[PDB]
Design a protein around this ligand. Sequence first.
Ligand SMILES: [K+]
Ligand SMILES: [K+]
Ligand SMILES: [K+]
Ligand SMILES: [K+]
Ligand SMILES: [K+]
Ligand SMILES: [K+]
Ligand SMILES: [K+]
Ligand SMILES: [K+]
Ligand SMILES: [K+]
Ligand SMILES: [K+]
Ligand SMILES: [K+]
Ligand SMILES: [Mg+2]
Ligand SMILES: [Mg+2]
Length: 1322
Amino acid sequence: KKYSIGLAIGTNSVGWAVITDEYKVPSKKFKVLGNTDRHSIKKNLIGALLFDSGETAEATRLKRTARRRYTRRKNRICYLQEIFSNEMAKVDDSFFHRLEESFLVEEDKKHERHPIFGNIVDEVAYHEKYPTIYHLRKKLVDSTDKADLRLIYLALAHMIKFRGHFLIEGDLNPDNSDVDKLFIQLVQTYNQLFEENPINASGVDAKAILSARLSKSRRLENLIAQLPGEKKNGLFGNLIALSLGLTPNFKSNFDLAEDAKLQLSKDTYDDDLDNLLAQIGDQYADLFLAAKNLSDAILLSDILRVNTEITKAPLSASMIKRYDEHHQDLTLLKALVRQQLPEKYKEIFFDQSKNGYAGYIDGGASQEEFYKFIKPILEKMDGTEELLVKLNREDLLRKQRTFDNGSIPHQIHLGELHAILRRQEDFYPFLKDNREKIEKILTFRIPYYVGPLARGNSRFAWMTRKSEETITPWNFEEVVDKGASAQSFIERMTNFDKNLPNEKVLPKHSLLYEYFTVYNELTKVKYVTEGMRKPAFLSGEQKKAIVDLLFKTNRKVTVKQLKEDYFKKIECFDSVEISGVEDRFNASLGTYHDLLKIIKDKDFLDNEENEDILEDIVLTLTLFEDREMIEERLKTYAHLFDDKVMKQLKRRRYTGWGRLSRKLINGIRDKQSGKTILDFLKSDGFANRNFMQLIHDDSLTFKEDIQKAQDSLHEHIANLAGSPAIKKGILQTVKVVDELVKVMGRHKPENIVIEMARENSRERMKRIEEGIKELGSQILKEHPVENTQLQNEKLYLYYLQNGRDMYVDQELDINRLSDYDVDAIVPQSFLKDDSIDNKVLTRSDKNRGKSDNVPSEEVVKKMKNYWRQLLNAKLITQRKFDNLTKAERGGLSELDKAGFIKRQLVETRQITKHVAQILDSRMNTKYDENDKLIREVKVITLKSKLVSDFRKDFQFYKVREINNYHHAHDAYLNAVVGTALIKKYPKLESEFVYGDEIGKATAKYFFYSNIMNFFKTEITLAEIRKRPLIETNGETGEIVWDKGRDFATVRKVLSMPQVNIVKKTEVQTGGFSKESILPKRNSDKLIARKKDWDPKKYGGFVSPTVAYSVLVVAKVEKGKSKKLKSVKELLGITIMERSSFEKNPIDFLEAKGYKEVKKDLIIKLPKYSLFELENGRKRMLASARELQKGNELALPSKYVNFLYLASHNEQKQLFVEQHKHYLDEIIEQISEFSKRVILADANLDKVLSAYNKHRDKPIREQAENIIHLFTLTNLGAPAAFKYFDTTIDRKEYRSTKEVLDATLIHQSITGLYETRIDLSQL
RNA sequence: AUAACUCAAUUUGUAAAAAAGUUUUAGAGCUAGAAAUAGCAAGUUAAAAUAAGGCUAGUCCGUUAUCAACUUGAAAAAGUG
DNA sequence: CAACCGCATTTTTTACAAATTGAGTTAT
DNA sequence: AAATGCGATTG
Ligand SMILES: [K+]
Ligand SMILES: [K+]
Ligand SMILES: [K+]
Ligand SMILES: [K+]
Ligand SMILES: [K+]
Ligand SMILES: [K+]
Ligand SMILES: [K+]
Ligand SMILES: [K+]
Ligand SMILES: [K+]
Ligand SMILES: [K+]
Ligand SMILES: [K+]
Ligand SMILES: [Mg+2]
Ligand SMILES: [Mg+2]
């Protein structure tokens, strides 16, 4: 009966309201179930559901993949030990047993406590000879004497267990030996090519300074310092930078207008270098060759700090170096500290809590914190200089297992492994027989395109089996079908053709697909000359000409190229106008030219008989990215081109998929024509019909063939694109609407109004680092920053703009930001954009020019080049750039302005439209005699601006900190305003409801900018106007608004004290506990990490999280007698024990000690369960041992508006000064509330005192802080707050005893239905 | 409002990998003195676990989504004022 | 007991698909 | 990245 629903959808809330034809919210009586006094209770139909945020699947994913990593590493070790098992059984009966029981205490061990050899003397001997595992590694690599099998194992297992990364393909083979001759060779060739001016080797110690432990940049700087008359930006400088691993740019050297940047580790190096050499002349090739030849002996200089002539183990040897220098410098540091500051020796070398050397080795101090702690001790001392030198290089007292070993490629560890196996296979036959297996254990790696090696029980797996063997690293290629697996990896994610749903989409770089795009764009190009009377299409012949002559010879085709190279040359038109394209064609035959460069056979690419082949090739190049498998897939075409061409095709790789199928573009045929879609795009006579037209033209049969070709609420919502949080909001919104419908007797509403709320330091620091380094700027060396600092908006913009004004061509001052202006590129009055994309730092905003538009044309002229530099450094995005420059395109036209304004009130967000479609499809389910949908319910969607402006305009002020009522209030107001709008302007249905020259632009602007004026009585537009007291619609005359009564109605609704705020109860899920592993200590609070690892002996976890609490009434044994005592208490069931408890609850509880459990009184109490006690005082159950505040403080509207105005028109100021007494009154309110439900006496006293101490402060400040006070009374978890400078610590409630005798309240989603249980009765 | 294309930014979801960290144990502490307690010597490494665990036993799975109460259901979700 | 103070696994790389937003060309 | 449920210290 005559009601509409208002809905405010948030990430943590859904406000809901029900309104009647005159904007009142009903008040109904609802039955109360349970064993309580109340049989019913009256409720207003307004409220809000609150809930914790929905989470992404990310954390779960990281955990799952980490899991798989651990189990596979374990299996690696197991494979190794299975190889060693028998021959180790002849040396040491129990070696592996001692290894796998090493973690146990002596009390629990089966065997002697010394793992390696099993006796004290031999193990002390071992650790004396090999203080680190790398000593053993190196000796086992270099030495030729037979070694103990157990040590061999320890070496191999250490290398397999920490095998390094896989970011470099192929193999490395360290050769640091000829860096001097290689540098001299580069200098040599360069001097051959530049006979005119040579560089002189000059005994420059290239080895020392390139293999130095600095960064590539500094090594460059220093190295080119030693070369006279040469600059780091010159040719040889850029070359050196290349040999180092940096990406330089060579265009300024070769007078090139096109960027030429080369990175020797990028897989595109061969073709970028071929590009460049084809531009500059191949006589330069031997230069870049030298760059590689050096780059190879120098690649790994940062890990291998040792001559490769002394060892085959440069890694283990460099680690031994770490150890020895650590030793020497430790002895020295000790001596020094003894001499000069002995009183500080203890703190440094004993106290583990201080971050000294003791804290460094035995405490929890990191190398960084240790260096930071001991830096002043060193530079203060004497005899220390080299230790500071080692400190700034981060090389002082290094361990061997360190955060920075992530640079080690697996090829190194593989080198040493191969070496050891080669040494000791001479003595152990089985090592020879199993050399390859072992190397494979270190080598093998499941390809990402295979996924888990599942067998029907992984929801995540997709791989397929060529055979039903158990899969090992040695039978992987024979048992796993890698081709089918790599196929499914992509085809399980790729879209099908929506027009032909049983057809797969073509590769985006398919030749056919690009012909389709080129022709689909070209077929709507029109042209005019002087003679003709109308613009005409291109004919089939003309299109084939434009394609064969321009598109198949130029990578990109410009309009100029079309006017000069076709129209002028082939049609003798000195002038012509082009209508269907701007500047240059968007589509292009990129793949045609890629394959032209590789295949060098244009007639092959033009031959239609090869179409299929070529498609299949580009499919392959797209589907797979493992070059080995691409080769396998291209073999069948190995006869069509020479070997080298096959070599180059291998490396050609494409990514991406289109939107349409091959059948669609060139498969389906028109019955009448016999022509495919592409046939029509190529030639369609006088009508040059589009893909869109072809697919919808009833004279052609494509559409009918397509139509011929053509689930639950929760899956549907989960399938949407968007934040899982807002999705949680959406589902909850649908369930709310369902309940309200039921509340209204299953009558559906007249309208449903929905509003959706809109909407990091490391990312920033990275942005600036890469953009600055690309920009060749020093501002980072000049002004060092730290991640967190860049949360400052103005500092971030300062760095994004290279410390420069964005509208003027002058520098900025880091020390003067407070004096500068942040300015919106397109002003805020049109685009409500707060992000960096629309903001700029400038000395003063006025120098942008006009305030009503894009930055003026002067500015564009003066700063355009600089903005381009920022774009190419990615320090601004394309959006920001185009917006900045729009004044050279007339800036903001009037139409664009009207556009922005209606975009401010009309919701265009896709996810919101999905919400509206869900609701519409749930509410409107019937079809009229003509099979058209009957739209009984109208779903309106509004942007936040309407209700916000409404609140400001009519002083229905909002303060979100006082309580949660504002969610509900917003929902109510959305219902009111939405229904009023649609009642007043029914045509605007098309704009706001779901379902199916320049002067007019100004009219739209003014119109949408004044749409909300039918609410006011007098309006000033910036002359005055006036409006009646009663607002109707003209055509119907129906009353839409009545300013005599309706505003007062709103005030009555906002003032209502009882508003149904419901915190959603939720079983907690996720981690069993905190992840930290604490040391052993006596406490039942420590949870075993494994069944048999008693934490009193081994330590364990703390803080398990309660999945849900349970009410238990039973008896407990008491004292030695074990006399049974009746109890009623709350037992937290932890996530880890939940499944056990649900399997059999009586056995679970009995094991916990409870006897004679009354099974029918067991009550599941998830987090946030609601309980009432005493004077309406409420608590929410956050845990089994802690409670949260459960009450809302309904502050009178007059105080809400007062606080709003005081915290921030002469009349309203007068109101503040006239009603200052409200302050004291407000506090009275709070005080009462607290003394009645918060029960935090001390904290309340500190509030009263701290306030009385600030009754002489400005009223603005006092109000702003009274607002702070409300977190003392807020619903939910207690929290700390500052009144002024008086920090009030939180007073939380950690008992939950009272709850057991309170009234439990089971709430509906709306809270309107309640079941109340008097727990006193149990 | 839809569809294809261009350029760009963002978000979601997935797989394969790396390095640390932590926790027990092993790296014979030494002299004094009865005892705590002093004095000095040392330290850098390794094994193993890294959600307890599960059955489907895979080199798989185990932290997302979804959840008032009562009656019905496996479950979804229905029926109840 | 209540007030009070402390604590919480971290980081790095590769490969891939789909939406969505927002500036453009063409169409239903 | 908080903040909020818990651990332990203390008063
Ligand atoms: K024993
Ligand atoms: K120089
Ligand atoms: K440490
Ligand atoms: K370590
Ligand atoms: K264009
Ligand atoms: K590919
Ligand atoms: K061939
Ligand atoms: K959950
Ligand atoms: K959670
Ligand atoms: K991503
Ligand atoms: K509920
Ligand atoms: Mg495990
Ligand atoms: Mg470790």
